[PDB]
Design a protein around this nucleic acid. Structure first.
Ligand SMILES: [Zn+2]
Ligand SMILES: [Zn+2]
Ligand SMILES: [Zn+2]
Length: 96
DNA sequence: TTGTCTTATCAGATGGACTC
DNA sequence: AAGAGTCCATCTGATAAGAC
């Protein structure tokens, strides 16, 4: 039940936090950082997944999922198909 | 019960569409 | 007409949760 504490949006291409760790949508997060006040009111080339919280690009400029993109950056080799975990994983990130 | 490694989820950078 | 500024999606980079 995540919600932008400024505008009330429940959907956004990227969730962000303010200095205190209060959640803000991408729009309200960028605005506050820039202005210092409140904002006024596809599939992976490697593993063929259609679901990720963040699309990245490979060296040729084609889309890869977050997992595949990060794996390649680290290892300089493509993510093997056997690494692909079923389901969606989430993590409780702490403040600051 | 600790250590490693994958990769979610945060933060920063870039630039197209739009207004001024 | 031609430049600077606003806005915010979407990209790259940083941090670190928790799978295993
Ligand atoms: Zn918002
Ligand atoms: Zn706040
Ligand atoms: Zn992938």
């Amino acid at each position: 039940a995540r919600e932008c504490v400024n505008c009330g949006a429940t959907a956004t291409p990227l969730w962000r936090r303010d200095r205190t760790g209060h959640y803000l949508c991408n729009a309200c997060g960028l605005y506050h950082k820039m202005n210092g006040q409140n904002r006024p009111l596809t599939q992976c080339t490697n593993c063929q997944t259609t679901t990720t919280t963040l699309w990245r690009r490979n060296a040729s400029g084609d889309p890869v999922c977050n997992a595949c993109g990060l794996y390649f950056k680290l290892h300089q080799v493509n993510r093997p198909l056997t690494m692909r975990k079923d389901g969606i994983q989430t993590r409780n990130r702490k403040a600051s």
